[PDB]
Amino acid sequence: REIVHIQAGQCGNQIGAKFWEVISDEHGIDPTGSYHGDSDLQLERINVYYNEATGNKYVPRAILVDLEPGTMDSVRSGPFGQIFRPDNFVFGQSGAGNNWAKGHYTEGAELVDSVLDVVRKESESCDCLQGFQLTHSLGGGTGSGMGTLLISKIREEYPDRIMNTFSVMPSPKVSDTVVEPYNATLSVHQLVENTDETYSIDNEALYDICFRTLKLTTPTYGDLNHLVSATMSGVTTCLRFPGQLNADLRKLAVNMVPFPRLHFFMPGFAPLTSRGSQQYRALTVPELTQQMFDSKNMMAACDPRHGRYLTVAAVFRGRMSMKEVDEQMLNVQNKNSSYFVEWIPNNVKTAVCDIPPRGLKMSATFIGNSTAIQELFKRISEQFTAMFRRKAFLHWYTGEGMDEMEFTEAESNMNDLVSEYQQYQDA
Amino acid sequence: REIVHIQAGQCGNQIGAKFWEVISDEHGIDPTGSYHGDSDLQLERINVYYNEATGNKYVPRAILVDLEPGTMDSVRSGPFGQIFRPDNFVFGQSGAGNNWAKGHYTEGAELVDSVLDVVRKESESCDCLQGFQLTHSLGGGTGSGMGTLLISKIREEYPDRIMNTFSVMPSPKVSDTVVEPYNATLSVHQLVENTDETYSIDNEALYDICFRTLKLTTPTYGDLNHLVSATMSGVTTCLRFPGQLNADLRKLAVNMVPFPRLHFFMPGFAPLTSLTVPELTQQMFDSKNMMAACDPRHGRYLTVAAVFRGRMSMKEVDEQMLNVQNKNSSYFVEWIPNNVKTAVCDIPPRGLKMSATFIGNSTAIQELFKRISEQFTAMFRRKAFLHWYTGEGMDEMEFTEAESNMNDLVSEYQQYQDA
Amino acid sequence: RECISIHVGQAGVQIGNACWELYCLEHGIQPDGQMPDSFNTFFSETGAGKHVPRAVFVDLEPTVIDEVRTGTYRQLFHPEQLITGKEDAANNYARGHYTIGKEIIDLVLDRIRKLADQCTGLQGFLVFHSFGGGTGSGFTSLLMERLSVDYGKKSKLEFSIYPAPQVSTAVVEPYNSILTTHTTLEHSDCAFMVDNEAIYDICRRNLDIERPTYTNLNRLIGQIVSSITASLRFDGALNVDLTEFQTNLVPYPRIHFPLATYAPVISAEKAYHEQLSVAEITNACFEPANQMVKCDPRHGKYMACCLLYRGDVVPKDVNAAIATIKTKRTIQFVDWCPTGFKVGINYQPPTVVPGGDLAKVQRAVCMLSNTTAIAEAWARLDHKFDLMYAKRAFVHWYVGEGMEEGEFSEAREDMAALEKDYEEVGVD
Amino acid sequence: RECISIHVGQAGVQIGNACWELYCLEHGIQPDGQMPSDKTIGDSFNTFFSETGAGKHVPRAVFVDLEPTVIDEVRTGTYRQLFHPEQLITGKEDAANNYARGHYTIGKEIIDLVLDRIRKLADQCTGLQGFLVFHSFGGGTGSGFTSLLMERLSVDYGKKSKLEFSIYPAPQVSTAVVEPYNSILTTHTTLEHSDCAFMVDNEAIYDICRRNLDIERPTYTNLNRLIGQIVSSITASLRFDGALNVDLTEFQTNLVPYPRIHFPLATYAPVISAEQLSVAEITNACFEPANQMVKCDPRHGKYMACCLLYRGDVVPKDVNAAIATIKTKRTIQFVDWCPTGFKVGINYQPPTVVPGGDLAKVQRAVCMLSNTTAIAEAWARLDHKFDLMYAKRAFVHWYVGEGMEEGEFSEAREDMAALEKDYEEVGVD
Amino acid sequence: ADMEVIELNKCTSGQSFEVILKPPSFDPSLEEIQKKLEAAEERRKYQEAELLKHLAEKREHEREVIQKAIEENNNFIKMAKEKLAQKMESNKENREAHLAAMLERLQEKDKHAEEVRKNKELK
Numbered sequence A: 001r002e003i004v005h006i007q008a009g010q011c012g013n014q015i016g017a018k019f020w021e022v023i024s025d026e027h028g029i030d031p032t033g034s035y036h037g038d039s040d041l042q043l044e045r046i047n048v049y050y051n052e053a054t055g056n057k058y059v060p061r062a063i064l065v066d067l068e069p070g071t072m073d074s075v076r077s078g079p080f081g082q083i084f085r086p087d088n089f090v091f092g093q094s095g096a097g098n099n100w101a102k103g104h105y106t107e108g109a110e111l112v113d114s115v116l117d118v119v120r121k122e123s124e125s126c127d128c129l130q131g132f133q134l135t136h137s138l139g140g141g142t143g144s145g146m147g148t149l150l151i152s153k154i155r156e157e158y159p160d161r162i163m164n165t166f167s168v169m170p171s172p173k174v175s176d177t178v179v180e181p182y183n184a185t186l187s188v189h190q191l192v193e194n195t196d197e198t199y200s201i202d203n204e205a206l207y208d209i210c211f212r213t214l215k216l217t218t219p220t221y222g223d224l225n226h227l228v229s230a231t232m233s234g235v236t237t238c239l240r241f242p243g244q245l246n247a248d249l250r251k252l253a254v255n256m257v258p259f260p261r262l263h264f265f266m267p268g269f270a271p272l273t274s275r276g277s278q279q280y281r282a283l284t285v286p287e288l289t290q291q292m293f294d295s296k297n298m299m300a301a302c303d304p305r306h307g308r309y310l311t312v313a314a315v316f317r318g319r320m321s322m323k324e325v326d327e328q329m330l331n332v333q334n335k336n337s338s339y340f341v342e343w344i345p346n347n348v349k350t351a352v353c354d355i356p357p358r359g360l361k362m363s364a365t366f367i368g369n370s371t372a373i374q375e376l377f378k379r380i381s382e383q384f385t386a387m388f389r390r391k392a393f394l395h396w397y398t399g400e401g402m403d404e405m406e407f408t409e410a411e412s413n414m415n416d417l418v419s420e421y422q423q424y425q426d427a
Numbered sequence B: 001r002e003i004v005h006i007q008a009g010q011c012g013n014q015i016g017a018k019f020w021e022v023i024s025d026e027h028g029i030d031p032t033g034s035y036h037g038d039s040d041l042q043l044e045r046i047n048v049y050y051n052e053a054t055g056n057k058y059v060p061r062a063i064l065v066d067l068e069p070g071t072m073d074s075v076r077s078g079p080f081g082q083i084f085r086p087d088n089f090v091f092g093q094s095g096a097g098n099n100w101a102k103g104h105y106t107e108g109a110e111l112v113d114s115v116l117d118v119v120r121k122e123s124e125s126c127d128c129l130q131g132f133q134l135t136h137s138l139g140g141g142t143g144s145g146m147g148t149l150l151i152s153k154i155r156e157e158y159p160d161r162i163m164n165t166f167s168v169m170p171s172p173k174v175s176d177t178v179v180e181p182y183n184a185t186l187s188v189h190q191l192v193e194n195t196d197e198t199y200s201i202d203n204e205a206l207y208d209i210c211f212r213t214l215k216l217t218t219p220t221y222g223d224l225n226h227l228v229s230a231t232m233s234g235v236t237t238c239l240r241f242p243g244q245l246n247a248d249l250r251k252l253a254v255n256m257v258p259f260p261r262l263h264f265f266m267p268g269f270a271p272l273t274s275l276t277v278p279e280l281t282q283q284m285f286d287s288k289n290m291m292a293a294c295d296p297r298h299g300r301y302l303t304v305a306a307v308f309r310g311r312m313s314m315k316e317v318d319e320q321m322l323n324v325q326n327k328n329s330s331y332f333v334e335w336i337p338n339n340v341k342t343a344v345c346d347i348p349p350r351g352l353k354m355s356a357t358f359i360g361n362s363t364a365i366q367e368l369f370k371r372i373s374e375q376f377t378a379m380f381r382r383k384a385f386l387h388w389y390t391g392e393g394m395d396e397m398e399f400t401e402a403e404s405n406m407n408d409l410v411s412e413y414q415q416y417q418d419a
Numbered sequence C: 001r002e003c004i005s006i007h008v009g010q011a012g013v014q015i016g017n018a019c020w021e022l023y024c025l026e027h028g029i030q031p032d033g034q035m036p037d038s039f040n041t042f043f044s045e046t047g048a049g050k051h052v053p054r055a056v057f058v059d060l061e062p063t064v065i066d067e068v069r070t071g072t073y074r075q076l077f078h079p080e081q082l083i084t085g086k087e088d089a090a091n092n093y094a095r096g097h098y099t100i101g102k103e104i105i106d107l108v109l110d111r112i113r114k115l116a117d118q119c120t121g122l123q124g125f126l127v128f129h130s131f132g133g134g135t136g137s138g139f140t141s142l143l144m145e146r147l148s149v150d151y152g153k154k155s156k157l158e159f160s161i162y163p164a165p166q167v168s169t170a171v172v173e174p175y176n177s178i179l180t181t182h183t184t185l186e187h188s189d190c191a192f193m194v195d196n197e198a199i200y201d202i203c204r205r206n207l208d209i210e211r212p213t214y215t216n217l218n219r220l221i222g223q224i225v226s227s228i229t230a231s232l233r234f235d236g237a238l239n240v241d242l243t244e245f246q247t248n249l250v251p252y253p254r255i256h257f258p259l260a261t262y263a264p265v266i267s268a269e270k271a272y273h274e275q276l277s278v279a280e281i282t283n284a285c286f287e288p289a290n291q292m293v294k295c296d297p298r299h300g301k302y303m304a305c306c307l308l309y310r311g312d313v314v315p316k317d318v319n320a321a322i323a324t325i326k327t328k329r330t331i332q333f334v335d336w337c338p339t340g341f342k343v344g345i346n347y348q349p350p351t352v353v354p355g356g357d358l359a360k361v362q363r364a365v366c367m368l369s370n371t372t373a374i375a376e377a378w379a380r381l382d383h384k385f386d387l388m389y390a391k392r393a394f395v396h397w398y399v400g401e402g403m404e405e406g407e408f409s410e411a412r413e414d415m416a417a418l419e420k421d422y423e424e425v426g427v428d
Numbered sequence D: 001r002e003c004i005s006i007h008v009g010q011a012g013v014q015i016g017n018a019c020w021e022l023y024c025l026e027h028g029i030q031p032d033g034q035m036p037s038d039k040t041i042g043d044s045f046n047t048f049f050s051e052t053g054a055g056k057h058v059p060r061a062v063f064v065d066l067e068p069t070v071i072d073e074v075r076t077g078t079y080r081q082l083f084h085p086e087q088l089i090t091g092k093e094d095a096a097n098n099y100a101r102g103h104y105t106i107g108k109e110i111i112d113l114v115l116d117r118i119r120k121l122a123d124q125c126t127g128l129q130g131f132l133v134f135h136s137f138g139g140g141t142g143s144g145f146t147s148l149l150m151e152r153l154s155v156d157y158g159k160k161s162k163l164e165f166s167i168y169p170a171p172q173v174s175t176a177v178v179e180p181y182n183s184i185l186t187t188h189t190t191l192e193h194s195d196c197a198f199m200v201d202n203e204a205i206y207d208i209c210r211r212n213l214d215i216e217r218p219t220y221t222n223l224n225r226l227i228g229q230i231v232s233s234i235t236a237s238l239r240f241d242g243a244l245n246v247d248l249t250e251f252q253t254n255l256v257p258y259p260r261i262h263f264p265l266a267t268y269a270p271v272i273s274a275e276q277l278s279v280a281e282i283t284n285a286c287f288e289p290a291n292q293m294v295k296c297d298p299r300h301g302k303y304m305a306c307c308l309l310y311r312g313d314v315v316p317k318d319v320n321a322a323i324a325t326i327k328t329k330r331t332i333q334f335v336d337w338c339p340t341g342f343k344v345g346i347n348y349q350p351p352t353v354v355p356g357g358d359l360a361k362v363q364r365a366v367c368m369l370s371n372t373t374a375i376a377e378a379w380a381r382l383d384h385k386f387d388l389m390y391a392k393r394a395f396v397h398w399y400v401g402e403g404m405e406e407g408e409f410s411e412a413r414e415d416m417a418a419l420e421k422d423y424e425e426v427g428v429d
Numbered sequence E: 001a002d003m004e005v006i007e008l009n010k011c012t013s014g015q016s017f018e019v020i021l022k023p024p025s026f027d028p029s030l031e032e033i034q035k036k037l038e039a040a041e042e043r044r045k046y047q048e049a050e051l052l053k054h055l056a057e058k059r060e061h062e063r064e065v066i067q068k069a070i071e072e073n074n075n076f077i078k079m080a081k082e083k084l085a086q087k088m089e090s091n092k093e094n095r096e097a098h099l100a101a102m103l104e105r106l107q108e109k110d111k112h113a114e115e116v117r118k119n120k121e122l123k
C-alpha cells in the first residue's frame, strides 16, 4: 500500500544508492524531475516507493543515516545524486568505530532520535504505510549497531507494521575489521527478534560469484554491490509493478515464514556480470530455472543441498510464456524432489512480471527459506567464540558500556537459532 | 339443501378452477352473468352450488385459499376468471414450503382465521347449509397442511354438518418434492378422523390413464386435471340436477360408509379426454379406469355407487348392472346385502352422448396407503429429511404418532376380508 | 264413528296423496273441497262449502309435503294439517326417533288433537309409513308410543311399506325396519304390510310397464287401500268400524300382519275385453302372483280369511265360486279355527284414476288373509339384518345419533321370538 | 419474494462482477441500468434488481473487501454506472491471507457498517427471502469476514435462509500456502449459520478450461466466466420464475436431507468453445467426473438427492427416455433410504453467453445438482493438508499473533473429523 | 265344498255373511318413558361435548408447536449472540496483552541501554 526506506551505514548506503538508481531507471526518473519513458505501467505502483512533491517531481521515500559525513556526500556527489530530499540526510559528525556498541549505545543513541524524527514524518505523511525496509552491513557499527537499534526503536513506535532488511553478513575473506564476527553475532541476535524477513547476503558469496563465475580479477566494492543492487530489484518488483500478484508485504511474509524466528531468506539471481561480458540472447527459461536453483548462484554462502527448503518463492522477468514456467518449475520439484519439506504442502509458488530490468531480456530471482542457512550462521559463530576464547578484541566494548555475559548472552541466542533449523530436518 | 366449497393449494386450486367452469357450463353461466342455454332444468338445484347476488348474476359459493398470490391470479387471469366474488380470495404472501408443518402450524394458523371468516359468512348466509366439500393435494403444505387444519377448525365450529374431500395422493413418479410421503402420511391421519367421505385420487393413476390409455406423450398438469375435473362433475351431479334421487349428502354418506374410519372411495370414469351401456359398464368396473392407483381385484368392494348420464334406456342399465355383480360376483362383500345401488340422470356432460362415474368404497384402497407408508418408513428410517420439520416445531414421535394411525387403517381394510 | 289419517314419511305421504286422491274420486269431490253421515267417516264438513280430509301429513324435509301445497289438492287440506320440518332424518331410525323427532313431536301430537276435537266419538287412526327409511321408521315409532298414551282404547291400524332392493336406494334399510317394527308392534292393532317388490312385480307382469315409477306403484296401492277402507266410508256390513278389523283378522295380540290380494288389475288398452267373471277373480286371490307381500301361502297355514268384494255382485255367485276353490285348489287351514270366509259385499262399483294405468272394472275382489306364510318376509328381512349386524356394519351411525348398541340386539331378539310364534301356530 | 447478494473478498467480488454481468445480459440491461423492456414499475426478475428512481435498475447486492483494489475496478469499467456508490464497501488495510485477521482484528471495525448497509437493501423489500454469500474458502477476508458476517446475519435475520458459494482452493492457481487453515477454520464457524452451500473447486474449473476450451494456462477472468455461467444456471429458477425450483425452501428442501450435509455437487452441461448437442447426450455428460465441479469421484460414493436443471429448448418428452438409459447403461448409485430422485427443472429461456467470451451460444444446457457422499473426498483432501501442517504448528503463530487461540484450531479440525464421519455414516444398512 | 252361510247383516249399500265350511276341531303401554327420550340425548350431549373436549385438545397443542418452535428459535439467537461477543471480548483481551507482552520486552532492552551509558560515564 506504501513503504519507506531506511538506508544506514557506509555499506548500507552504497547499496542503497545503487538500488535506488536501478529501480529509478525501471520507472524512469530524471536525476531530479519526473517520468521519461515510452512505457506507461511503471506509475501504478510508483506510489509505493516514491512520495511525490510539488512541481513535476518524484523524490524517494528514503532516509540515509551515517555516523560521519564522508559517505553521504558520496551519494550526493555521485550518480543519482541530488535525488533525495535534502533534510532526509541524517549526518553523523562523530566516529563510527566499526564497533557495534558505539552505534547501538553511545554515539548511536546520541543521534537516533533525529532519525526517528524523519521516519516519523515520512511514515506519518504516508497515507497507508505498510512497512519499512532497511539496508546495512552486519560487521561494523553504524549500520549493524545503529540499525539494529533503529529497528528496535522502529517497532514499539510501529509494532503494527512489518519490518524487513537486506543485511550484509561479513566474511573473514574480503573485509576491513578483525572484529566483525563480534559485530554480527550482536545484530543477528537483534534481528531474529525484531525483523519479519531478512535477506541474507554473504560477501563470501558476492565475491565468489565474481571470481568463480565472472573471471573478474580485482573485485571492487563496485562490481559486487552491482549484484545486490540487481537482486534487490528482483525481490521488490511485485510490490512495485504488475497487478498479477498483489503482494501485501504482510501477506508476503505470512506466506514465507512458518516459524517466527528463522526468517532467513538466502536469495539468488538469474544472469550476471557487467563489464567485458555479455549473454548471446540464450537465457532460455529451462537454463534460467536450474540456474536460479543452482547454489553457486546464491546470495548467501550456504548450499541448499544439506539443509532443506522450508518455503521458496520465485519471480520471473520478461515477455516469455509461463506455459513453460510451471512446467520447468514442476520438473525441478521432481529433478530435486527430495530437498523440499513435505509437511508444508504447496510450498513453492512462482509468479511472473514482464517488463525487463536494465539490459537483460529474460531474468529470474529466487527468494529462499532454506534451513541450509544454518550453514551461514554456524560459519560466523565458528569464528566468534574462536575470538571469545580468552576474550580478545572485546576490550573496546568492555569499557564502552557493555557487559561480560552480554556477548555470551547472544553467543547463546544464536546457538539456539543454529540448532532449531537442524531441528527442522523433520518427519 | 345447500353446500359451500373450499379450494385450497396450487393443486387444490387449479382443480377447483376446472371443476367450476365445467359445472358452470352444465348449468350454463356467462363468465360473469347468468343463464344462457335452451335447457331449463339446470336452475332447480343451482341453488346448491351457487349463492346468487344482485343484478342478474350467480357467483359460486367458493373460498380459495393459498399461502401465496401466484396461483390465485392464475384463476382470476385465466378461463372463468372474474366469476368468484373478489373477497372470497384468501391470500398468502408468505412461503408455502411444500411442507406440512408450515401450512398446519406456523404460516398456516397465521391465516386460517381469515379463511374461517369467509366460510363463516357464506355458510351463515346460506339458508340451510348442508355441508362443505374441499379440494387439495396431500403431498405439499398449503393444501394438505392448511386444509387438514381448515377441516379441523371447520368441525368444532360445525360438528353438525358433513365434511368431504377430493384429495390428491401423490406419487413418487410425477411429483416435485422429495418429501411428499411425509406430507401425506400427516394429513391421511388428519382426514381419517375429520372427514365423512374422501375421494382418493392418485396422480399415479391420473398419469397412467394418459399413457397406457390415451397416446398423450407429455402429460401436463393440464390434461390430467381434465380427468379430475370430469370425475368431480360426475360425483356431484345428483345433488345438483334431477330429482330422481334426492341425495341429502348425509343420506349419501350414511349409505356409503359402514365403518366410521375407512371412507376412502376410489372413483373412476366412463369415456376419456378431448359408448353403448354394456361397453360403458364393463369399463367403469375396470381398474385400467380407476382414479386411485389400485386394482380393485386384490380387495373386495364394500359398497359401490355408479351414476349414469344420457337419455338412454335404463331398462338396459340394471340389466348390465346385475351382470357385473355376477360375472364379478366373488368380488363384492356378502355381509352388506343390497350394497351396489345405481342411479341415472339424463342431462349429458360437456360433449359426450353417454357417460358414467363410479364411486367405490373398496378395501383394495389399502393398496394405496401401504404404498405411501412403504416409502414413508423407508424414510422416517434413519430419520431423513425430517429436519425440515424438526425445527419447525414438530415432534420426533408426532410422526410415529401418525405413522401408526395409518398402519391401522391398513390392517383394518385387511381385517375386512372376513366371513 | 270418526276416523283420522296420519301419513309420516316421504313414502307415507305419497301413498297418502295418491289415495286421498282416489277417495276424492270415489265420493265425488272436486279438488277445491266442494262436492255437489256416510262418508263423514273420513272428511269433515268444515265451513260452508268445503270438505277437508281428516288427515295429518308429516315429514322431516319439506320437499314432499311441499308438492302438496303445489298441485291442485293444494285447495283440499288445511295449511295446518301438513307439518314439515327443515332438516332430514337421513335414512336412519335413531335420527328419526331420538334426535330430530323430540323437536317436532310435541307439535304434531297436538295438531292431531285439533282434529280429534272436531269429532263426537272418534274411532282410531290410520298411520301410513315406510318400513325401512328414516322418518318413516323413526317418527312413526315415536308417534305410536305417544298416540298410545294420549288416546285410550282408540285403535291404531298401520300400513307399512316393506322395502325392496330394486326400487330403493338405501343399504341400511333392514336395520330401520327391524328397529321400528319392534318398538312399534306393542302399540299397533292390525298392520297391513305392502311389499314394494310385489307391487313392482304386478306392474311388470300385469300392466306392461317396463320399469315402473313410484307414482306408478302408488296408484296401485291407492286402489288396494281404498278397497280395505271401503267398508267404513260407504258403510256396508263387516268392518263398519276399526274394532272389527282386528276381531276378524287378528286371533293373537302379536300376529297383526294380514296378507292382502287385489283382484282384477288390468290395463286400459285392455279396457274393453269381455270383462272378468265373479268366479275367476275370486280364483285369482289365491295366486302367489297377485299377492301383496312376496311369499308362498300354498305351504303356510291360513288362520283367518276375509273376502272383500266391490261392485256388481249377487252373493248367490260368490258362494259356488268359493265352493270350487275348495274342491280344486289348496284348502290349507289351521288346526283350530272354522274354515273362514267372512264375505263383504259393497255395491259401489270401483273407480280408477282417470288417465291412470288400470281400467274401470265391473267387479273387484280383495281377500284379507292372516296366513303364517307372511312370516317368510319376516325372515327374508331378518337375514339381511343379521348378516350385517354381525360385523357392526352400519351401526356406528346410530350409536352416533344417540342410540344403544344393545337396543339393536334387543330388537332382533323380538323378531326371533316373533318368527317363533308364527312357526308355533302350525298343527298339533 | 426478494433476494440479496453479498460478495466478500477478492475472489467473491470478481465471481460476483462476472455473474452480475451475465445476469445483465440475460435480462437485457444495458450497463447504465436502464432496460427498454416494459417490465418496470416499483414482477418476474425483480427478485434480484430493484426498480430504483425512474430509469435505472440497481442490483440488490453489497460488495465488501478489505483492500480497495478490487472493489475499485468496479467503480472503474462500465457497470460503474450500475450499482449505488453505497453498495460497495472497501476497507483501507488488507486481511493478509489470514482468518484471524479477517474475523477478529480487521473485521470488528467494518462489520458494523456493512451489516447496516445490507439492512438498507432489506428495507426496500416487502418480504425478503434470503442471502447469497459469495466468498473464497481459503484466503483472508473471504474466510474470516464471511464467517463473522454469517454469525451476525444469523442474529439480525430470523428464518431468512443463507446460501453460500464457496471457492475451494487449488494449488495450481493460488499463491497462498496457509490456505487450508483458513478454509477449515471458517467452514467450522460458518456451517451452523449456513443453509445449503455450493462448493466450487478451482482445480476442476481450471481443469474444464484446459480440456474443454483449449486455453493453455487459464486466467482468473477465464475461470470466472465459467462459474458465472454455472451460478446463473442455479439462480435461474428464481429469476425468470421457473416451472420448478420456484422458492428458496422448495428449491432446497430438495437438496439437504440432513442439517449438516449442505454441500451439493454441481455439473454444467455443454461447455463448448466458439471459433449442436442432443438432449440425450448432455444429460449423459452430467454424470462424467471430468465435467464435474468439485474434483472427486461419485461413481463410488452413494447419491442421496439428485436434481436436474435444464435450460433452453426442451420438451420433457425427451428428458425422460434419456434418463431411462442413464439407469440401464451407467452407475445408478443410490442411498439406502431415499426414492431414486430426479426433480427435473425446465426453463425455456435459452442460455446466453458473454459476447466475445470463450464459450458459444447453446440451444440446450443441463445442470444436475447432486448431493452425493463422494463430495467428502475434498473434505479430506483438504483436512490432510491442515493436519500435516498443524502437526508442526507450521503457520499457527501468525494467528495466535492477531489474537487467536491455539485451541480454536484443534476445535475446528474436530468438526471436520466429525463431519467426515457423518458423510461416511450415510452409506448403506 | 257346499256349505251354508251364516248371514251376518244387511244395510243401505252392502251385505255381510260368514261361510263356515268344516268345523274348527277342538284345540300395558307405559307412560314413564318420556325420560327415555332425554336418556338418548344424555349420550349425544356427551359425545359431541367430547369431540370438543378432545378437539379443543388438538387445539392448544397447536399453541405449543406454533410457539415451542419460536421459543426454541430465539433460544439459538440468544445462545449465539454471546457465543459471539464473549468469544470476541476474550479475543480483544487476548491480543492486547500480547501487544504489551511485546512492548514490556522493549522497556527492558530500553531501561538496560539507559543503564549502560550511566556505566560508560563511569568506566
Ligand SMILES: Nc1nc2c(ncn2[C@@H]2O[C@H](COP(=O)(O)OP(=O)(O)OP(=O)(O)O)[C@@H](O)[C@H]2O)c(=O)[nH]1
Residues within 6 Å of the ligand: C008, C009, C010, C011, C012, C014, C015, C059, C060, C061, C088, C089, C090, C091, C130, C131, C132, C133, C134, C135, C136, C137, C161, C162, C163, C164, C167, C168, C169, C170, C196, C214, C215, C217, C218
Ligand atoms: N311405495 C312407495 N315406496 C316408497 C316411496 N318413496 C320411498 N319409498 C320407499 O321407502 C323406503 C325409504 O323410505 P322413505 O319414506 O323415503 O324415508 P323417509 O325418512 O320416510 O323419507 P325422507 O323424508 O325422504 O327421509 C325405501 O324402501 C323406498 O323404496 C313411494 O313413493 N312409494
Ligand SMILES: Nc1nc2c(ncn2[C@@H]2O[C@H](COP(=O)(O)OP(=O)(O)OP(=O)(O)O)[C@@H](O)[C@H]2O)c(=O)[nH]1
Residues within 6 Å of the ligand: D008, D009, D010, D011, D012, D014, D015, D065, D066, D067, D094, D095, D096, D097, D098, D136, D137, D138, D139, D140, D141, D142, D143, D167, D168, D169, D170, D173, D174, D175, D202, D220, D221, D223, D224
Ligand atoms: N475462482 C476464483 N478464485 C479466485 C479468484 N481470485 C482469487 N481467487 C482465489 O482466492 C482464494 C483466496 O481468497 P481471496 O479473495 O483471494 O483473499 P481475501 O483475503 O479474501 O481477499 P483479499 O482482500 O484480496 O486478501 C485463492 O484460492 C485464490 O485462488 C477468482 O477471481 N476466481
Ligand SMILES: Nc1nc2c(ncn2[C@@H]2O[C@H](COP(=O)(O)OP(=O)(O)O)[C@@H](O)[C@H]2O)c(=O)[nH]1
Residues within 6 Å of the ligand: A008, A009, A010, A011, A012, A014, A015, A096, A097, A098, A099, A137, A138, A139, A140, A141, A142, A143, A144, A168, A170, A171, A174, A175, A176, A177, A203, A206, A221, A222, A224, A225, A228
Ligand atoms: N557489498 C557491500 N558490502 C560492503 C561494502 N563495504 C563494506 N562491506 C562489507 O560490510 C561490512 C560493514 O560495512 P561498513 O560500512 O564498513 O559498516 P559501517 O561502520 O556501518 O560503515 C564491511 O566491513 C564489509 O565486509 C560495500 O561497498 N558493499
Ligand SMILES: Nc1nc2c(ncn2[C@@H]2O[C@H](COP(=O)(O)OP(=O)(O)O)[C@@H](O)[C@H]2O)c(=O)[nH]1
Residues within 6 Å of the ligand: B008, B009, B010, B011, B012, B014, B015, B096, B098, B137, B138, B139, B140, B141, B142, B143, B144, B168, B169, B170, B171, B174, B175, B176, B180, B203, B206, B221, B224, B225
Ligand atoms: N393433478 C393435479 N395435481 C397436482 C397439480 N400440481 C401439483 N400437483 C400434485 O400435488 C402434489 C403437490 O401439491 P402442491 O400443489 O405442489 O402443494 P400446495 O401448493 O402447497 O398445495 C404433488 O405430488 C403434485 O404431483 C395439479 O395442478 N393438478
Ligand SMILES: CCOC(=O)Nc1cc2c(c(N)n1)N=C(c1ccccc1)[C@@H](C)N2
Residues within 6 Å of the ligand: A003, A133, A164, A197, A235, A236, A237, A238, A239, A245, A247, A249, A251, A252, A253, A255, A256, A313, A314, A315, A349, A350, A351, A367, D175
Ligand atoms: C520490501 C520488499 O518486500 C520484501 O522485502 N520481501 C518480499 C518479497 C517477495 C515476497 C516476500 N514474501 N517478501 N514474496 C514474493 C512472492 C513470490 C511468489 C508469489 C507471491 C509472492 C515476491 C513478490 N517477492
Ligand SMILES: CCOC(=O)Nc1cc2c(c(N)n1)N=C(c1ccccc1)[C@@H](C)N2
Residues within 6 Å of the ligand: B132, B133, B164, B165, B197, B235, B236, B237, B238, B239, B245, B247, B252, B253, B256, B305, B306, B307, B341, B342, B343, B359, C169
Ligand atoms: C360433495 C359432493 O358429493 C359428495 O361429496 N359425495 C357423494 C356424492 C355422491 C354420492 C355419495 N355417496 N357421496 N352418491 C351418489 C349416489 C350414487 C348412488 C346412490 C346414492 C348416491 C351420487 C349422487 N353422488
Ligand SMILES: [Mg+2]
Residues within 6 Å of the ligand: B010, B096, B098, B140
Ligand atoms: Mg408448489
Ligand SMILES: [Mg+2]
Residues within 6 Å of the ligand: D066, D094, D095, D096, D097, D098, D139, D140, D141, D142
Ligand atoms: Mg486477505
